[PDB]
Every structure is written in structure tokens, then in C-alpha cells.
Amino acid sequence: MEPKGVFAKEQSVHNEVQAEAGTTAMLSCEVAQPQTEVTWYKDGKKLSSSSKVRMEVKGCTRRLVVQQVGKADAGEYSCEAGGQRVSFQLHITEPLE
């Protein structure tokens, strides 16, 4: 057993979470089909640069490492891959301190 479809959801990103800005999240993806296309969407729409973002491509391993340090970068993160979609919602919650 191993195949499931395009892009394996080995990403700690697939749910609604509300937390203060500064939460580090790493997306790990292992695609079953190489036809997978690399295409990420920010806050649902391509905005300006804010949070730290880096691309790591090597063979079939496709992983985007993003650190939520910018509040402005908060928004809908939809990860597309060939023929698959990911649903995640980041909300900035002021400290309860």
C-alpha cells in the first residue's frame, strides 16, 4: 500500500486554526503521481511579501516551508497539486496576556 492520488497530504496543514502571529508551520508533501503541478495560493490571493517563504524542490519531494511571522500574511492558504486541493485558514489572534 502507498498510492492514494496526487500529492500526499503529509502536510501539517489541513484545518482551521486561530492563533497569535509567530506560529511556525512546515508542509511536507510526497506525491504519488509526478504529474503533480507545483502551485501554492497565498491568503487565497497573491498579495505582497511579508512572512518568510522558501521553496524546496528535489526529485519528487515537494515541500514549502512557511513561517507565520507576518500578521498581514494571515489569510486563506489553498495548496493546489495537479488535481488536488488543500483547505487551511490562518487567523491572527491578539495575545491573551
UniProtKB/Swiss-Prot annotation:
Start and end residues of each Ig-like domain: 3-93
Compartmental location: Cytoplasm, Myofibril, Sarcomere, M line; Cytoplasm, Myofibril, Sarcomere, Z line; Cell membrane, Sarcolemma; Nucleus
Modifications the protein undergoes after translation, according to the UniProt entry: Autophosphorylated by protein kinase domains 1 and 2.
Covalent S-S links between cysteines: C29-C79
Highest taxon above the source species: Eukaryota
Protein purpose: Structural component of striated muscles which plays a role in myofibrillogenesis. Probably involved in the assembly of myosin into sarcomeric A bands in striated muscle. Has serine/threonine protein kinase activity and phosphorylates N-cadherin CDH2 and sodium/potassium-transporting ATPase subunit ATP1B1.
Subunit details: Interacts (via protein kinase domain 2) with CDH2 and (via protein kinase domain 1) with ATP1B1. Isoform 3 interacts with TTN/titin and calmodulin. Isoform 3 interacts with ANK1 isoform Mu17/ank1.5.
Family, per entry: Belongs to the protein kinase superfamily. CAMK Ser/Thr protein kinase family.
Disease linked to the protein: Rhabdomyolysis 1: An autosomal recessive disorder characterized by severe and recurrent rhabdomyolysis, usually with onset in the teenage years. Some of the episodes may be triggered by exercise or heat; others occur spontaneously. Rhabdomyolysis is the rapid breakdown of damaged or injured skeletal myofibres and may require intensive care management. Muscle breakdown results in release of myofibrillar content into the extracellular space and circulation, resulting in hyperCKemia (hyperCK) and myoglobinuria.
Protein name per the record: Obscurin
Source species: Homo sapiens
